[PDB]
Amino acid sequence: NAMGSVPVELRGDFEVCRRLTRSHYENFSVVSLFVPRHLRPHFYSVYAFCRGVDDLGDEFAGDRMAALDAYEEELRRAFAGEATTPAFRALQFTIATCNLPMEPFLRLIEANRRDQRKHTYDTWEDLRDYCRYSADPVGRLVLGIFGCLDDERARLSDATCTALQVANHMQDIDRDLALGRIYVPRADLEQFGATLDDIRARRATDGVRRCIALEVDRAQALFDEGRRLESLVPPRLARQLKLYRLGGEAILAAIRRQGYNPF
Numbered sequence: 001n002a003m004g005s006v007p008v009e010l011r012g013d014f015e016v017c018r019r020l021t022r023s024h025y026e027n028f029s030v031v032s033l034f035v036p037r038h039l040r041p042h043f044y045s046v047y048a049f050c051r052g053v054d055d056l057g058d059e060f061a062g063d064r065m066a067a068l069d070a071y072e073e074e075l076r077r078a079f080a081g082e083a084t085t086p087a088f089r090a091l092q093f094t095i096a097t098c099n100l101p102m103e104p105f106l107r108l109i110e111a112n113r114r115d116q117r118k119h120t121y122d123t124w125e126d127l128r129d130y131c132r133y134s135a136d137p138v139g140r141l142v143l144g145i146f147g148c149l150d151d152e153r154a155r156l157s158d159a160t161c162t163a164l165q166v167a168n169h170m171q172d173i174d175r176d177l178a179l180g181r182i183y184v185p186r187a188d189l190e191q192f193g194a195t196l197d198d199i200r201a202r203r204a205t206d207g208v209r210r211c212i213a214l215e216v217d218r219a220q221a222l223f224d225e226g227r228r229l230e231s232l233v234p235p236r237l238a239r240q241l242k243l244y245r246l247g248g249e250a251i252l253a254a255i256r257r258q259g260y261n262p263f
Contacts, residue, residue, distance in 0.1 A: 002040035010093055014041045016086040017048035024051040034240040042098055042145045045090040049075075050138070052087065053108050057115070058179070064116060072109050075102075100144045104137035111137075119180055120196060123187045124218070127169075128162065135165035146237045153232055160226030164244060166219040167251040170212060173199065173262035188214055204261040212260035216252050223249055 006014050021044045022028055032043050056067045074088050079102055083092040094100065111133035121127045139157035143149040169176070169183040176183060182199050189195055191214075194207025223245055230238045230245075 002037045002044070005038040006041045006093070010090060013086040013090040013093075014044060017041075017044040017090045020044075020051050020087065021047040024054070030243075034236045034243070036236055039145055041090070042094045045087070045094040046138075046141050046145070048087045049091055049105065050108060053112050056112060065113070068109055068112055072106065075105050075109065094145075098145050098147075100141060101149070104140045104144075107133045107137040120182050121185050124185045127166070127183060127185050131162040131165050132158070135161040142237070142240075143233070146234060148233050148237065153229055156226055156229035156232070159222045160229065160241065160245060160248075163219045163222035163226060164248045166215060166222070167248045167255075170215055170219070170255055171251050171262070174202070177202070184211060184215070202263045204259075204263060209260040212255065212262070216255055216260065219248070220252055223252075 003011050003014060003018070018041075025031065025047060028047070032040060035043050052071060053068075056064060056071065060067065074083070074085060075091075077083055078088045078092040079095060081092065081096075083089045111130070114130055114133055118126075118130070121130070136158040139161035140149060140154050143153055143157055173182075173184065177199065182196055184196075184199060186196060189198070189207065189211045192207035192210040194205055194211055198205050198208050226241075227245060230241050233241070
C-alpha cells in the first residue's frame with residue numbers, strides 16, 4: 001500500500017494521481033513492478049502529470065497552445081509551493097521530496113508543441129531532437145525519484161529512453177500514418193533511394209526495408225550504450241531498466257523477424 005508512505009493530508013491527492021495513472025496507462029503494473037512502496041506515489045504523480053500533457057493532444061478541444069500555457073503555469077506554481085489541483089498538490093510534494101528539477105517537466109510540455117508543428121522529419125538529428133522532449137525527460141525524472149540524477153547517468157538514461165521511442169516509432173509506422181504523421185527521417189529514406197511516398201503508399205520496397213534496418217541498428221546501439229546505467233543504480237531501478245531494455249530489444253527483434261516490413 002504505497003498510499004500509507006505519504007503524509008495523511010496528501011493521501012487524497014495522491015489517490016487521484018493513482019486513479020488517473022492506472023486508468024490511463026494499461027500496463028502500469030509492469031512499468032512499476034520494481035518500484036518500492038515508498039517511491040510508488042512519486043511514480044503516480046509524475047505519470048498523472050504526463051497524462052495531463054497527453055490529454056491536450058490530438059483529441060483535445062480548445063487552443064492547445066493556451067491550454068499548454070495554462071498547464072505550464074500550474075507546473076510552475078507547483079515549484080513555487082502554490083499548486084491548486086489535487087494532481088499538482090501531489091506533484092508539489094513529489095518535486096520537493098525527490099528534489100526534482102523543472103526542465104524535464106517543461107520539456108514534456110514542449111514535446112506536445114513539437115508534435116503540433118511537425119508531421120514529417122527531415123533528418124535523424126531532427127527525430128533525435130524530438131526524443132529529447134518526448135522520451136528523455138521521463139527517464140531523467142525516474143532517476144530523480146531514485147536519487148540517481150546526475151549528468152553521466154542522465155546521458156545513459158537518454159540513450160535508453162530514445163532507443164525505446166525509436167523502436168516504438170518503427171513498429172508503429174501504420175498507426176502513425178493513419179494519424180497524418182511519419183517519423184521515418186526523409187534523408188534516411190532517400191539514402192536508400194526511397195521516399196516518403198513509399199511510406200504513404202504502404203510499399204515495403206528494398207529502400208524502405210533498408211531504411212527501417214538503419215533505424216533498428218541505431219536504436220540497438222542506443223540500447224547497448226544505455227545498458228551501462230544498470231550497473232550504476234539501486235538493484236530495484238536496475239531491474240526496471242533492464243526490463244524496459246528487454247521490451248525495446250524484443251520490439252527490434254520482431255521487426256527484424258518481419259524483414260523490416262511495417263504495414
